Design a protein around this ligand. Structure first.
Ligand SMILES: Nc1nc2c(ncn2[C@@H]2O[C@H](COP(=O)(O)OP(=O)(O)OP(=O)(O)O)[C@@H](O)[C@H]2O)c(=O)[nH]1
Ligand SMILES: [Mg+2]
Length: 175
């Protein structure tokens, strides 16, 4: 029997949340993924864990209507950033801090930041994305940052393994 955990996939519109989930669940890269106009629900299993992926649209309208509930009901949060869109790093930092770092509804749950689109020539490194999001100023929450690509699959297995390990560690430490 597997334990069900709900994971909220958040991040700005165009960050690559839906494309990463498609690469993991279908094994294929879609370079023409369409904007999510609400919620996509998908599943993937990794060992004793059934991951229920809540892929929420990142457009402003969906942050204000849907993000609060799915973030508050999740067991883990994945915040995806387009590393090749530095014109939106300040906006991505603002939303990460409002909806995750300083959101009182987020307890001591796993927080994984994915610095996505590493395959693109203008992609900033994981270190550069961490500094742009002020991750080095996060004082009370644990977090991980992983550079990845839905196009090549780079680090997607390792990122999912990190989440499975953190969720399993919480279960084992409590027992
Ligand atoms: N080259 C490249 N393109 C990517 C990658 N991830 C996503 N894309 C592309 O980036 C665009 C936006 O990806 P989406 O998956 O729709 O982004 P999203 O975060 O789900 O956006 P919303 O649905 O608006 O929340 C699409 O054209 C994707 O094909 C990646 O790692 N590399
Ligand atoms: Mg989407």
């Amino acid at each position: 029997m597997k334990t069900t955990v709900k994971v909220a996939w958040v991040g700005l519109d165009y960050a690559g949340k839906s494309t990463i989930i498609k690469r993991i669940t279908q094994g294929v890269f879609s370079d023409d993924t369409k904007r999510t106009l609400g919620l996509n629900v998908d599943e993937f299993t990794s060992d004793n864990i059934k991951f229920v992926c809540w892929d929420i649209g990142g457009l402003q309208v969906f942050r204000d209507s849907l993000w609060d509930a799915y973030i508050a009901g999740s067991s883990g949060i994945i915040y995806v950033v387009d590393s090749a869109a530095p014109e939106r790093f300040e906006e991505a930092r603002t939303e990460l801090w409002k909806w995750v770092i300083e959101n009182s509804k987020v307890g001591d749950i796993p927080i994984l930041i994915l610095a996505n689109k590493q395959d693109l020539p203008e992609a900033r490194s994981a270190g550069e994305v961490a500094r742009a999001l002020d991750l080095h100023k996060v004082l009370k929450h644990s977090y991980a940052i992983v550079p990845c690509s839905a196009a090549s699959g780079f680090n997607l297995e390792d990122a999912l393994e990190w989440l499975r390990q953190r969720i399993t560690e919480m279960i084992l430490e409590h027992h």
